[PDB]
A = this chain, B = another copy of it.
Amino acid sequence: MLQFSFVSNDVVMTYDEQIIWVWESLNKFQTVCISRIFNFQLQDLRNPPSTVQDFNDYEYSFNFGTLNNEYITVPGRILSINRDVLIHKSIKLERKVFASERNVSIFGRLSKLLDHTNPIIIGGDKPEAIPKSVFQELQSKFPNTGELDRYANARVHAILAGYLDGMKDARERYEHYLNR
A20 / chain B contacts, CB cutoff of 8 Å: none
Asked whether A156 is an interface residue with its Cβ less than 8 Å from the other chain, the reply is: yes
Check B104–A156 contact: CB distance below 8 A.
yes
Chain A positions near chain B (C-beta within 8 angstroms)? 100-104, 106, 109-110, 113-114, 134, 138, 141-143, 147-149, 151-153, 155-157, 159-161, 163-164
A138 / chain B contacts, CB cutoff of 8 Å: 159-160, 163
Contact (A152, B148) CB under 8 Å given A138-B163, A164-B113: yes
Closest chain B residue, CB of each to CB of A164? B113
Cα-based distance from A103 to B153 in the complex (angstroms): 9
Check A113–B160 contact: CB distance below 8 A.
yes
Copies of this chain present in the complex amount to 2
Check B159–A151 contact: CB distance below 8 A.
no
Cα-based distance from A159 to B104 in the complex (angstroms): 13
Contact (A157, B109) CB under 8 Å given A143-B151, A148-B148: yes
Cα-based distance from A138 to B149 in the complex (angstroms): 18
17 contacts between A and B (CB under 8 A): A100-B152, A100-B156, A101-B152, A102-B149, A102-B152, A104-B153, A106-B160, A109-B153, A113-B161, A113-B164, A134-B163, A138-B160, A138-B163, A142-B156, A143-B152, A143-B155, A148-B152
